[PDB]
Amino acid sequence: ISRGHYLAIAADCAACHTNGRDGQFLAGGYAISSPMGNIYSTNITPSKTHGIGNYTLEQFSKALRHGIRADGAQLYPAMPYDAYNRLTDEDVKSLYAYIMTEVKPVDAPSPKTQLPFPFSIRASLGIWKIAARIEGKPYVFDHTHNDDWNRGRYLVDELAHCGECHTPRNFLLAPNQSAYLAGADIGSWRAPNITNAPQSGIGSWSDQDLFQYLKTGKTAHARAAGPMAEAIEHSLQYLPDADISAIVTYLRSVPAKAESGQTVANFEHAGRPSSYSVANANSRRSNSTLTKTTDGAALYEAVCASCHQSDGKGSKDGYYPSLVGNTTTGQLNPNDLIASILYGVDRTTDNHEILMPAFGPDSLVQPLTDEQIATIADYVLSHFGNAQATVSADAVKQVRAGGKQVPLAKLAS
Amino acid sequence: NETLSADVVIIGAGICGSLLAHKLVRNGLSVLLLDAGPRRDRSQIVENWRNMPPDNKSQYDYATPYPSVPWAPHTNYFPDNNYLIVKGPDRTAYKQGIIKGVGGTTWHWAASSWRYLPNDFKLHSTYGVGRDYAMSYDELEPYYYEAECEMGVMGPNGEEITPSAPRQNPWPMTSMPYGYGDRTFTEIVSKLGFSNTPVPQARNSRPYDGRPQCCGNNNCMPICPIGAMYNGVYAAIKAEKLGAKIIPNAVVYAMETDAKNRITAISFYDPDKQSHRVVAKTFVIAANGIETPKLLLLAANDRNPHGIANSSDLVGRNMMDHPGIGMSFQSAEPIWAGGGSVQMSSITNFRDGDFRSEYAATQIGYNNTAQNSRAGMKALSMGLVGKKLDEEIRRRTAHGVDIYANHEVLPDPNNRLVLSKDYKDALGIPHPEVTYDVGEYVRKSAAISRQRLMDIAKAMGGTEIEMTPYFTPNQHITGGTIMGHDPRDSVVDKWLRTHDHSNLFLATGATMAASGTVNSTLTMAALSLRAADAILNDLK
Amino acid sequence: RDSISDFMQLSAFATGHKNLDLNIGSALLLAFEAQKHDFSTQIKALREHITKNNYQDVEALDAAMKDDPLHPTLIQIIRAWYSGVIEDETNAKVYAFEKALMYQPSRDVVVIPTYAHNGPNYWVSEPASVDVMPAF
Ligand SMILES: Cc1cc2nc3c(=O)[nH]c(=O)nc-3n(C[C@H](O)[C@H](O)[C@H](O)COP(=O)(O)OP(=O)(O)OC[C@H]3O[C@@H](n4cnc5c(N)ncnc54)[C@H](O)[C@@H]3O)c2cc1C
Ligand code: HEC
Ligand code: HEC
Ligand code: HEC
Ligand code: F3S
């Protein structure tokens, strides 16, 4: 594979430019759940009609880094041009060559993004970029640290754009540089803090654990799910081991961002040796639909204890992760666990596929209600993860809706 | 309700009905799905099965986890609910299992979906025994693969397993590897000259359709805790999301027709015994092999006093199934049944031949259900204590073996479902009463089936060999409304429309012509999709 | 709260195993006392019998009183602790599944029918012998 292909893989450009697993290669049409609405990524195949075959080198550089289309229209910040802005000129040229030559053109117009006023007009984004402090000098090798640290910083900040989802956004919805890699809500899912904080972040993670998580997406204490599963499946898995080592080296040097009310790391939460009583479950025999089993322990045992066994320690093989000592369960904020219950983990690493059965209202295996999911999540947190974490039915409904409506999103009225 | 109008109605939200509804809503037709049973949820069924007594778990009890609702009762033999009255020389050979509820009896099948051989569709033409399908195997293969991909069926993609149905394209899956028991059974029957072959299963060897990979719980009967198989509830959910209206607890009893014999509307009850007239421009009856004939004989009106769709006086007649002789013993050599699914391998060496003109084909399958419950119950029955009891439990669970052999019956019109004139439920609907008979054909086939099974047990060096003197039921309820060309000789046509009523379709086991030598629900699914094509052509 | 202690002690003696759930034992005592009012009298009598004849294992405690009508309840209690049911009909309640001691001696190989064993493709590995006792 060529340098352009490697840069496209590291940049994970195929994650949003191919609508799901199906669809053509870099043909656009993928729906991104932006806070203000649904935005459709565009086609970038070298198609002279509906692609970017007419794009020149400088036009491509503008689109990639400064988020300016060929016609001058400002690209929406779903484009991580704030993350590709510091990308080096040589890498931009290599990506341009790869896109122009190495991917088959596809002639299929992408859906046009429709947003409410004033998000419909794609011209106010100049002020947004000015206030976002995007620019944005191209990346330069920092001689204070070694080469591995510089390569890791390049991968995390510019190519893999981990800050696009692991950094919170301000009221104006721009990356918050003060809380760098401090964890953020990206809608239905929450990216956890990945700083060097031993308790709040991933500082207490072993180097082998971090390498395994970033390469295969599975670890004794963490499993990649949702958007992180997509990133692992599409970009991180194809990354060479040297690049993963560089990313680990950089991640073990980012400033820590401790969270209030957190005392134990997300993977050091032991589980209480408690469960439900089978005798209590006799009374609800000959009574389907689970409407009457409002309790939590029996609900978890009926629904999910087949794989994560009654003790919650997961399968002995490791295919089914231990709910005890799990970062998703050990998180003080339970948004990740609610998302895993709703939509589930579907990660295809090296042609081998994990797949959650989804447990949302439109689940195929087992539908569950908001209060039902709240009770079972409360049982899981209390017995397996963070006891101080609490889940309400309104919280589950909110997670289904796509998280908190950001205060800038209320403006569409 | 003043009137529950719709475009297409499907009586019975089972696998056939749910596939019908899904395919029809996928094409933009207002589909209304009526189900006699209640809304049924997987996890609660798992919880009830966990809490069944191990005595009912040693035996293959598959109806206790599903409550038998009084308005729509379903079969349950451990208390002998007596919903399915069966008499005749082989009354015990038709004590079928059926589950009423969204999803149907396939809520608790082994997902052993099978493709019938080409000769199964021309049995009558090639041997003079049985009745022939109006449709050839080639006419069904497209829809057959359509259903196969719909439920995500496994299968030995690269293998010349046995003379079997030719495939235009391979199975969507590759069969998951055998457990220890299946491998050892395959070796034993290979040394016996029998060919043990992987069984196509509507089961996830790899993640499919958003349902996880089979982790080998070994509870395929009667509930999947993770849903790694396929159940009709999946297609019911897909249809409901796509626009199909589903009313559980909808037991239809009668329907009205005009002088043109075009049935105009149908009516059903809640548990509260309230009638609601349902009108649609094309009705489909997809209830069961058993329930479709009972519904058709129960909905007789002034225009059709002999039963609806019963002009030939054959609805309810000509019952069919796979008479299985299940034999369980104790192997001398350890087996460890339980690894994988309950139905992984089966001997297909005798699925076809020239002997079908004389006696039925046999499909000798080895049941892979775990014997831990059976071993525990049997070891505790003999009153052993302490370490001896533990050793016996381990021995009987590592040596527990169940072997069976299924056959096919010829069409006997005397096998009625004449509804009992004495028994009724809370709704007043009479129970389906079967005057079942197997035939000298089945007796002759079983005469060699018993010897074959005994030889298989002998090869294992088996002890406490228990053989059922009777035939066990396999719940492959086919026949009842036999299809064909002549309105006076068969019930429905090739396209599964009743000759009496062109606007009425039935897609279930009832229309199946020859029972075949192997499981049939894949064939019912293919017939249901052919029916879907029929209504699609009808209403455009 | 002596009765639960004597129940647990005798049960651990009779089944020959030590790791027994206290909740399951409490449920078993509740079911037994609901079934028969005189459960406490005969259970204390059995405990006194073990104390006075200094029993070592359960094979002797099974063989010695074949004619005594107290052996019935010992068979009943071991059946309850190994299976999880008191009565025999379908209505009989289940107080122990996935923990019943009849499933335990084969837990290492044969999957408990609903609770998944390790991994989704474990059965490809060959199983252990028949004469090895996993645990408990
Ligand atoms: C224990 C068991 C194991 C099996 N294993 C296999 C296997 O391995 N492989 C295989 O191929 N097959 C197997 N089968 C057979 C398979 O389950 C059935 O053949 C198939 O599911 C047929 O279902 P159906 O939808 O046609 O009817 P059903 O699913 O029985 O019924 C559908 C629905 O119709 C409703 N209904 C019925 N009558 C009326 C009425 N008058 N009005 C309104 N609604 C009504 C009922 O409420 C029901 O919910 C097995 C069956 C059993 C019992
Ligand atoms: C009952 C509703 C539950 C609950 C509470 C959880 N699960 Fe699962 N799960 C399964 C697999 C295969 C994975 C991980 C990925 C893999 O290794 O390929 C998981 C993961 C989880 C997590 C961790 C998620 C993460 O973001 O790290 C949690 C908290 C969790 N599960 C809880 C498999 C299955 C199942 C198939 C057998 C079933 C059923 C469940 N899980 C059910 C549940
Ligand atoms: C750049 C390559 C990275 C790196 C180094 C990491 N991520 Fe992500 N990530 C995302 C989400 C939604 C989750 C959580 C999933 C769930 O809640 O189960 C994660 C998780 C992680 C972790 C695990 C931390 C822990 O669980 O405590 C780590 C170490 C991690 N990530 C590192 C989302 C995204 C994402 C889309 C918004 C992108 C891009 C990345 N992550 C990229 C990276
Ligand atoms: C996670 C999502 C995502 C990733 C990663 C991504 N893009 Fe895009 N891209 C988008 C979206 C969304 C738009 C359009 C939004 C806008 O108009 O503001 C876009 C627009 C573009 C455009 C403008 C073309 C036009 O006609 O709109 C180009 C060129 C482009 N992307 C190229 C790339 C390249 C090169 C990469 C690196 C491989 C990449 N993108 C990575 C989502 C993504
Ligand atoms: S119940 Fe399901 S997980 Fe496997 S053991 Fe049967 S297909």
- Contact (CB, 8 A) for B8 and B535: yes
- Contact (CB, 8 A) for B7 and B30: yes
- Contact (CB, 8 A) for C121 and B205: no
Based on the fold, state whether residues A295 and A176 are members of the same structural domain.
Answer: no
Q: Which residues of A touch B43 (CB under 8 A)?
A: 290, 299, 302-303, 366
Tell me the backbone φ, ψ of residue B21, rounded to 5 degrees: -60, -45
Best interface-test mutation with B: which of C55, C110, C117, C122 has the largest number of B CBs within 10 A?
C110
Based on the fold, state whether residues A309 and A211 are members of the same structural domain.
Answer: no
Distance A87 CA to ligand 4 centre (A): 15
Sheet order of strands, B31-34 included = B245-247, B31-34, B8-11, B282-285, B504-506
Q: What is the DSSP letter of C126?
A: P
Count of beta carbons in the 10 Å neighbourhood of residue C88: 11
Candidates B23, B487, B470; CA nearest to B286 is B23
Best interface-test mutation with B: which of A304, A355, A363, A373 has the largest number of B CBs within 10 A?
A355
Chain A positions contacting chain B at CB under 8 Å are 278, 281-282, 284-290, 293, 298-299, 301-303, 306-307, 319-320, 346, 353-358, 362, 364-367
- What number of residues does chain C have? 136
Based on the fold, state whether residues A369 and A402 are members of the same structural domain.
Answer: yes
Give CA separation, B41 vs A364, A368, A405, C91, C107, in Å: 11, 10, 33, 21, 28
Helices and strands in chain B, H and E counts: 12, 18
> Which of B476, B485, B499, B501 is flagged as catalytic?
B476
Torsion on CA atoms B81, B85, B87, B91, rounded to nearest 10: -50
Residue minimizing CA distance to atom 17 of ligand 1: B106
Best interface-test mutation with A: which of C22, C29, C86, C94 has the largest number of A CBs within 10 A?
C94
Q: What is the DSSP letter of A384?
A: T
Of A69, A104, A132, the one marking the end of a domain is A132
| Spatial distance between the Cα atoms of B487 and B501, rounded to a whole number of angstroms | 11
Distance A228 CA to ligand 3 centre (A): 5
Residue B405 corresponds to which tokens in the numbers above? 């052999």
Based on the fold, state whether residues A324 and A364 are members of the same structural domain.
Answer: yes
DSSP string spanning B114-167?
-PPPGGGGSHHHHHS-S---SS-HHHHHHHHHHHHHHHT----SS---SS----
Based on the fold, state whether residues A307 and A386 are members of the same structural domain.
Answer: yes
Residue A30 corresponds to which tokens in the numbers above? 């993928």
Tell me the backbone φ, ψ of residue C90, rounded to 5 degrees: -65, -30
CA triplet A377, A381, A384: central angle to 5 degrees?
120
Candidates B34, B13, B207; CA nearest to B106 is B13
CA triplet B252, A363, B100: central angle to 5 degrees?
25
Based on the fold, state whether residues A236 and A153 are members of the same structural domain.
Answer: yes
B399 is annotated as an active-site residue = no
Beta strand residue intervals within A130-260, DSSP E:
184-185, 190-191
Helices and strands in chain A, H and E counts: 16, 6
| Partner C contacted by A310 (CB < 8 A) | yes
| Spatial distance between the Cα atoms of C44 and C59, rounded to a whole number of angstroms | 20
Sheet order of strands, B327-330 included = B196-198, B345-347, B363-367, B400-406, B327-330, B463-467
What is the identity of the amino acid at A261? G
| Spatial distance between the Cα atoms of C63 and B388, rounded to a whole number of angstroms | 13
Q: Which residues of B touch C84 (CB under 8 A)?
A: 54
| Spatial distance between the Cα atoms of B348 and B269, rounded to a whole number of angstroms | 44
Residue B265 corresponds to which tokens in the numbers above? 């509307």
Structural domain of A156: 147-251
User: In B33-135, which ranges are continuous DSSP H helix?
Assistant: 42-50, 54-58, 123-127
Whether A256 maps to a domain, the answer reads no
Of all ligands present, the nearest one to the C-alpha of A197 is 3
- Resolution at which this structure was determined, Å: 3.1
Q: Is the CB of B312 under 6 A from ligand 5?
A: no
Tell me the backbone φ, ψ of residue B265, rounded to 5 degrees: -155, 165
Residue B343 corresponds to which tokens in the numbers above? 């139905």
Nearest chain C residue to B227 by CA: give it.
C114
Based on the fold, state whether residues A356 and A246 are members of the same structural domain.
Answer: no
Residue minimizing CA distance to atom 12 of ligand 3: A191
Long-range CB contacts (< 8 A, 24+ apart) of C29-38?
Answer: C29/C3, C29/C4, C30/A279, C31/A279, C31/C80, C31/C86, C31/C93, C31/C95, C32/C77, C32/C80, C32/C86, C35/C86
Give CA separation, A131 vs A62, A134, A135, A410, in Å: 19, 8, 10, 20
| Spatial distance between the Cα atoms of B303 and B282, rounded to a whole number of angstroms | 19
Residue A191's region, left for phi above 0, alpha for psi from -120 to 50, else beta, is beta
- Contact (CB, 8 A) for B225 and C126: no
Q: Which residues of B touch C126 (CB under 8 A)?
A: 180
Based on the fold, state whether residues A9 and A125 are members of the same structural domain.
Answer: yes
User: In A146-193, which ranges are continuous DSSP H helix?
Assistant: 147-154, 163-166
Q: Which residues of A touch C120 (CB under 8 A)?
A: 319
Count of beta carbons in the 10 Å neighbourhood of residue A25: 14
Domain B8-538: what homologous superfamily? FAD/NAD(P)-binding domain (3.50.50.60)
Per-residue b or e along A51-79, where b marks 16 or more CB atoms closer than 10 Å to that residue's CB: bbeebeeebbbbbbbbbbbeeeebbbbbb
Q: Which helix (H) or strand (E) holds C103?
A: none
Give CA separation, C22 vs A257, C15, C16, C76, C95, in Å: 44, 15, 16, 18, 12
Would you call C5 helix, strand, or coil by DSSP?
Answer: helix
Residue A162's domain is classified under what CATH number?
1.10.760
Of all ligands present, the nearest one to the C-alpha of A336 is 3
Query: In the beta sheet, which residues pair with residue B268?
Result: B252, B276
Ligand 4 pocket: which of A41, A84, A96, A134 to mutate (most atoms within 8 A of CB): A41
| Spatial distance between the Cα atoms of B196 and A23, rounded to a whole number of angstroms | 41
Whether A44 maps to a domain, the answer reads yes
Whether A302 maps to a domain, the answer reads yes
Q: Do A307 and B215 touch (CB under 8 A)?
A: yes
Residue B356 corresponds to which tokens in the numbers above? 């079908």
Contacts of B163 (CB under 8 A, 6+ apart): B117, B351, B352
CA Rg, chain C, in Å?
Answer: 17
Q: Is the CB of B11 under 6 A from ligand 1?
A: yes
| Spatial distance between the Cα atoms of A155 and B424, rounded to a whole number of angstroms | 74
Whether A398 maps to a domain, the answer reads yes
The position carrying tokens 């949302």 is A360
- Contact (CB, 8 A) for B97 and B62: yes
Separation in Å, CA of B146 to nearest CA in chain A:
19
Of A132, A159, A175, the one marking the end of a domain is A132
Based on the fold, state whether residues A74 and A156 are members of the same structural domain.
Answer: no
Based on the fold, state whether residues A207 and A233 are members of the same structural domain.
Answer: yes
Give CA separation, C113 vs A317, A318, B186, C56, C98, in Å: 18, 20, 22, 35, 9
3-state percent helix, strand, coil for chain B, nearest multiple of 5: 30, 15, 55
Candidates B324, B317, B281, B350; CA nearest to B481 is B317
Tell me the backbone φ, ψ of residue A403, rounded to 5 degrees: 80, -175
Give the method of determination.
cryo-EM
Residue B157 burial (10 A CB sphere; 0-12, 13-18, 19+): middle
Please tell me the total count of domains within chain A: 3
Q: What separation, in Å, do the N-terminal and C-terminal C-alpha atoms of chain A show?
A: 49
User: In C1-101, which ranges are continuous DSSP H helix?
Assistant: 2-15, 22-35, 39-52, 58-63, 71-83
